[PDB]
Design a protein around this ligand. Structure first.
Ligand SMILES: [Zn+2]
Lengths: 452, 345
């Protein structure tokens, strides 16, 4: 054994109490398998990049390009349902781009145009920005022409000292008059003798005024959010209370994800009772093996078998021919053998150890089966992934990694089908991929017949 | 197609659409990130729920549905019911504490938002720790993990901006990664710098001798406790391994890993050995006393290599007595019928 509690043959089939070792020599060390548990699946390149994409064929996707498109990068395929339009209904199996995708889920249009100086555009925008529904093409009037060409409501941001009126609680504490006592009314200087209304024009910064210390004198944004702003929603209990109550109760989720009616996102501004409700809805958008794993499970091959049967003998030769090639794969799958959800990878079998040695050479040199550098590739990535999810997760970085990850999962399986991995500067050599082991220049089945 | 370009384009495009303004936007987000903390904690205070739980539930509602909880972290938090229960108590929080809830989420968002904006910063940094032995994307990714680290500790109260702060927290993450993953046989950070200093020194030594320094110079130039045995050792660990699979001789079709022999495995000669040895050792063990013979047979051939602790109840005098008298009768009759003499080894 490893520690030596049991050391001969009498007890040959038992394992050690404190450490696990059942024995017959290290041949076990060369025939046993270990597995790596993948964060977010990836797929076998053996099944995705053979001429007939066995998954492209079975899953009616662009047999060769739709795959490559969603697989390695972020081109999403709406999996189950996505009510909101592009101009046409939800595309059951069609794919879209980041851009348009972006436009969807958050809210139709994003327009942040922030003014150049402190008094020209800051005023045009402010006057028409807070409660006024700004129609498309709202021609803001000062630097050049601030053009707001899209939908519903508007939210501006910071302001200097041209004149302070109707703004949020930021400045309230600055001039102690209104936040300390009820003096905002006398704040209007001299005509009151003959909601926010401040002095004629006394403050010029985005600060806190204990002593003018916590500040930030800068620019003022006027970002038009194309979303519908509700101020006084009411209570109707048919379905679970939607949106909000007058002022007390707020049943809506906070300001990220909340589906009320056909409109599905809800931001919250406790300034005025304002429940910002954006319009897009539950749009299942996925990219990568994740997306295909789903698609693959959902299919009842029997149905597609019978569907292709009809497609096969009835329409003309163009679409029926494609259907015969697509019925081939589906047939065997159902015929005898195993079912098709397995083509996707989430559990990576690891080749035995003694078969990917680590050995002492001359001088004290060492030598290991190239396979091991590839393995580390995957394990490192897979781990960095887990930790990247846990730490917190900014989208770009998670996919970025998922990509690498995928690539890696190819590497051990088969190298070169998509790019060729290299040991560091020394030999621009393809690290023998498990594939290269089987076939290869001088591979396995190959030299299995060259001689022993 | 080709992976570098796509990611570069990917984040550069988003920075291109959202860089963070120098002061305003980083200030803004920062403020929100901190308030989230203060919020979450006060939330743990009133709910009796661990800040870890309050943190994960707000994450789910702002970053992802049941999907992101189920696949990433296996299953301890019920995908629907569990998280929801938690959100309900958050709602129940009247006007006063409800405020922290709404803040926590918005803060969580800001966070994730700032993280996005400062990704060009990472890549710019990561760009220079290139030829260290890590993949540019691996490098950026670790550096990225570093920026996330900085986000947890930055105190906006202390005026300095996130730029200079991220630099450190990123450079730290990168260099570690470089030291931890670069080699196939892991080498501690100290050995790493050690190797850098060793290399650098060999460089200044190459400068004038015209003689690639004998391990004498390196010792000297390096410092206090450096000797020939030390340097010969470090440079031996510095050489990365070789590809067990490598083109050898005339690269026509030669693969290096077939030439190494095997040691544990009993080449036939040894299997035959154990057969006769054990059969003859077994014959002698029986025609004797199963006393001091098995003691020394089992103590030596069964477990580990203790005269006194060798025999059961009978002391040392009977041990040496039968050990040496049986061992010699055994040897001297084995001298007669010579079977063992021809040293099986
Ligand atoms: Zn043991």
């Amino acid at each position: 054994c490893a520690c030596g509690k049991y050391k001969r043959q009498r007890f040959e089939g038992k394992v050690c109490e404190r450490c696990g070792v059942e024995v017959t020599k290290s041949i076990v060390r060369r025939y046993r398998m270990g597995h790596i548990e993948l964060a977010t699946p990836a797929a076998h390149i053996w099944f995705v990049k053979d001429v007939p994409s066995k998954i492209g064929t079975l899953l009616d996707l662009s047999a060769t390009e739709l795959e490559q498109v969603l697989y390695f990068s972020k081109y999403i395929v709406l999996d189950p349902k996505g009510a909101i339009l592009n101009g046409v209904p939800v595309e059951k199996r069609q794919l879209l781009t980041d851009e348009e995708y972006r436009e969807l889920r958050y809210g139709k249009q994003e327009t942040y145009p922030l003014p150049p100086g402190v008094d020209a555009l800051v005023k045009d925008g402010e006057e028409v920005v807070k409660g006024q529904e700004l129609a498309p093409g709202v021609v803001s009037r000062l630097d050049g022409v601030a053009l707001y060409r899209f939908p519903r409501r508007v939210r501006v941001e910071y302001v200097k000292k041209e004149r302070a009126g109707l703004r949020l609680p930021l400045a309230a504490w600055v001039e102690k008059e209104a936040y300390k006592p009820g003096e905002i009314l006398a704040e209007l200087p001299e005509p009151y003798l003959f909601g926010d209304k401040i002095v004629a024009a006394i403050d010029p910064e985005e600060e806190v005024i204990a002593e003018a210390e916590g500040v930030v004198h800068l620019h003022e944004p006027a970002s038009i959010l194309v979303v519908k702003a509700r101020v006084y929603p009411f209570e109707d209990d048919v379905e679970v209370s939607t949106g909000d109550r007058v002022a007390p109760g707020d049943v809506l989720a906070d300001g990220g994800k909340v589906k009320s009616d056909v409109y599905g996102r809800v931001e919250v501004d406790l300034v005025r009772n304002v429940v910002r409700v954006v319009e897009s809805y539950d749009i299942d958008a996925r990219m990568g093996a994740e997306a295909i794993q789903q698609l693959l499970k959902e299919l009842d091959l029997e149905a597609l078998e019978k569907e292709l049967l009809e497609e096969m003998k009835h329409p003309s030769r163009a679409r029926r021919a494609k259907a015969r090639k697509r019925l081939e794969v589906v047939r065997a799958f159902l015929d005898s053998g195993n079912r098709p959800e397995w083509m996707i990878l989430e559990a990576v079998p690891v080749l035995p150890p003694d078969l990917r040695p680590m050995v002492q050479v001359d001088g004290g040199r060492f030598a290991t089966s190239d396979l091991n550098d590839l393995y580390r590739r995957l394990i490192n990535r897979n781990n960095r992934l887990k930790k990247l999810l846990a730490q917190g997760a900014p989208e770009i970085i998670i996919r970025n990694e998922k990509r690498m990850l995928q690539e890696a999962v190819d590497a051990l399986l088969d190298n070169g089908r998509r790019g060729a991995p290299v040991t560091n500067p020394g030999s621009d050599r393809p690290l023998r991929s498990l594939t290269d082991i089987l076939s290869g220049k001088q591979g396995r089945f190959r030299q299995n017949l060259l001689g022993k | 197609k080709i992976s570098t370009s796509d990611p570069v384009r990917q984040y550069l495009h988003e920075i291109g659409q959202v860089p963070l303004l120098t002061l305003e936007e980083e200030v803004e987000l920062a403020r929100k990130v901190e308030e989230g903390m203060e919020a979450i904690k006060k939330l743990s205070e009133i709910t009796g729920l661990d800040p870890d739980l309050i943190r994960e539930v707000v994450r789910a509602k702002i970053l992802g549905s049941a999907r992101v909880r189920h696949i990433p972290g296996l299953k301890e938090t019920l995908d629907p019911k569990t998280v929801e229960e938690i959100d309900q108590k958050l709602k129940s929080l009247p006007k006063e504490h409800k405020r922290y809830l709404h803040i926590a989420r918005e803060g969580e968002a800001a966070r994730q938002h700032l993280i996005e904006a400062n990704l060009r910063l990472v890549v710019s940094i990561a760009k220079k720790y290139t030829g260290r032995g890590l993949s540019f994307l691996d490098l950026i990714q670790e550096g990225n993990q570093g920026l996330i680290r900085a986000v947890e500790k930055f105190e906006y109260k202390r005026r300095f901006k996130f730029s200079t702060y991220a630099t450190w927290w990123i450079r730290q993450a990168i260099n570690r990664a470089i030291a931890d993953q670069a080699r196939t046989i892991r080498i501690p950070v100290h050995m790493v710098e050690t190797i850098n200093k060793l290399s650098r020194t060999a460089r200044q030594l190459q400068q004038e001798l015209g003689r690639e320094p004998t391990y004498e110079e390196i010792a000297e130039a390096m410092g206090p406790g450096w000797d020939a045995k030390r340097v010969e050792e470090t440079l031996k660990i510095a050489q990365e391994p070789v590809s067990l699979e490598t083109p050898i001789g005339d690269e026509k079709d030669s693969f290096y890993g077939d030439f190494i022999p095997d040691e544990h495995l009993p080449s036939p000669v040894d299997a035959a050995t154990q057969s006769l040895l054990s059969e003859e050792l077994e014959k002698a063990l029986s025609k004797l006393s199963e006393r001091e013979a098995m003691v020394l047979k089992l103590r030596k051939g069964l477990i580990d290599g203790e005269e006194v602790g060798a025999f059961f109840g009978v002391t040392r005098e009977r041990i040496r007595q039968i050990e040496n008298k049986a061992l010699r009768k055994l040897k001297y009759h084995e001298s007669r019928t010579r079977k063992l003499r021809d040293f099986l080894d």
